[PDB]
């Protein structure tokens, strides 16, 4: 068959971060030669694997968790990094196995009016477990001041939207940031290389 990276990477709208897509992939040839070697990816990594070796390797779980983040914050998405992202809206484990990819979007994902579809979680009352999607917008109460379903003084509407101009510096130009992940050994492999 075929693995639909072409509909993972090349898809139109990327979800904002606080709701991060999770697209399983299975029962297909997953050919990493056409990704890594496109060389348009202004960053990259791989962690429990080294990207060239993959072509020969057989996974099971393959989860492309796409999302848009702010240029300086890719640093925060990795194992071992804490900060507003990895702590609040999107976690990564530390022992996590698989690559991390980004290439600036700033042609598309930004409008001069700073497209605000892209938005994330600022105030959450804890710091995520590994891979916990948090979709709840229920208003935040900083002190003892009852919010009662409205914005309040020392209350917080927990979400926040990045202003993106297209003209931002490299820091605040939005990066599309995919991630991946996988099982490696001991389970029957729907995924393959060539």
């Amino acid at each position, epitope marked *: 068959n075929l693995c639909p990276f072409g509909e993972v990477f090349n898809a139109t709208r990327f979800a904002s971060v606080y709701a991060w897509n999770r697209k399983r992939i299975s029962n297909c040839v997953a050919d990493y030669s056409v990704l890594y070697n496109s060389a348009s990816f202004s960053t990259f990594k791989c962690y429990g694997v080294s990207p060239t070796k993959l072509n020969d390797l057989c996974f099971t779980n393959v989860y492309a968790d796409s999302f848009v983040i702010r240029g300086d914050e890719v640093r925060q998405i990795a194992p071992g990094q804490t900060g507003k992202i990895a702590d609040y809206n999107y976690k990564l484990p530390d022992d996590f196995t698989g690559c991390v990819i980004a290439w*600036n979007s700033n042609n598309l994902d930004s409008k001069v*009016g700073g497209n605000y579809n892209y938005l994330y979680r600022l105030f959450r009352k804890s710091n995520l477990k590994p891979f916990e999607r948090d979709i709840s917008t229920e208003i935040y109460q900083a002190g003892s001041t009852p919010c009662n379903g409205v914005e309040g003084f020392n209350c917080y509407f927990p979400l926040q939207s990045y*202003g993106f101009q*297209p*003209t931002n*510096g490299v820091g*605040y*130009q939005p990066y599309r940031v995919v991630v991946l992940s996988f099982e490696l050994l001991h389970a029957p492999a729907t995924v393959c290389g060539p």
Partner: antibody
Framework: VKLVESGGGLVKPGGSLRLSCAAS????????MSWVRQAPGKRLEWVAE????????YYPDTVTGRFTISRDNAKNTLYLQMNSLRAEDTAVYYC?????????????WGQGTLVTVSS | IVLTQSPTLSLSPGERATLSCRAS??????????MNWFQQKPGQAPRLLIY???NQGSGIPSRFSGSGSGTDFSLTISSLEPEDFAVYFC?????????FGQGTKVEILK
């Protein structure tokens, strides 16, 4: 904080000319750049915008004299053609540096340079 | 898309300056904050003042102040200095080419 320009120039109307701005004192990859003109007796016309890493390059419409802009980053440098040189195009151009995103911004400045479109 | 400023105002030291930045079309934007302020002195290329009227600044005397709402951003100064007057410019942003103010110069007698 630190910028350089070309000096003034004289071209017959109808032709083209390439214009320069030389930058220093920061990382010239990480700040989008923009040209701006001042027409004497007229409020500042904002000339054009460029991205930071690779070209966004959007202009005002008006009519474009098809001024084309590009950065040469390893040279920390900015470039402006203006084709279709015409009388009103006489003005003081400026190369200005944005900042990391905000309600803006436009912070620092090239001091500005005259334009002579004349016979 | 069309900003405008007051035709003229002339002032004196100690006075609190407010110039009318007249914005056609929308009021600010859904971004909740926009525009800007700038000052062109003779022989001195212009300079940032307060971005989105709401914020800054370094090198910016706190005597500089203001805010904005609707179609008119509110300029504020306190106890001017007779050498510190220059035309103030308010940008648009977020919509259309950004342009600038038609211009107005604080001017002092005596």
């Amino acid at each position: 904080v630190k910028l350089v320009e070309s000096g003034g120039g004289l071209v017959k109307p109808g032709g083209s000319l390439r214009l320069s701005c030389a930058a220093s004192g920061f990382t010239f990859t990480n700040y989008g750049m923009s040209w701006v003109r001042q027409a004497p007796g007229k409020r500042l016309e904002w000339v054009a915008e460029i991205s930071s890493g690779g070209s966004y390059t959007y202009y005002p419409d008006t009519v474009t004299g098809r001024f084309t802009i590009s950065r040469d980053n390893a040279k920390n440098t900015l470039y402006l053609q203006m084709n279709s040189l015409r009388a009103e195009d006489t003005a003081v151009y400026y190369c200005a540096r944005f900042r990391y995103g905000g309600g803006g911004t436009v912070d620092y400045w090239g001091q500005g340079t005259l334009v002579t479109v004349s016979s | 898309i069309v900003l405008t400023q007051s035709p003229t105002l002339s002032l004196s030291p100690g006075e609190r300056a407010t110039l009318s930045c007249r914005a056609s079309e929308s009021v600010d934007n859904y971004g909740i904050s926009f525009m800007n302020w700038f000052q062109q002195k003779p022989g001195q290329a212009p300079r940032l003042l307060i971005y989105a009227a709401s914020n800054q600044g370094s090198g910016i005397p706190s005597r500089f102040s203001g805010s904005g709402s609707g179609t008119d951003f509110s300029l504020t100064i306190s106890s001017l200095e007779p050498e510190d007057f220059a035309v103030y410019f308010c940008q648009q942003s977020k919509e259309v080419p950004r342009i600038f103010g038609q211009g107005t110069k604080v001017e002092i007698l005596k």
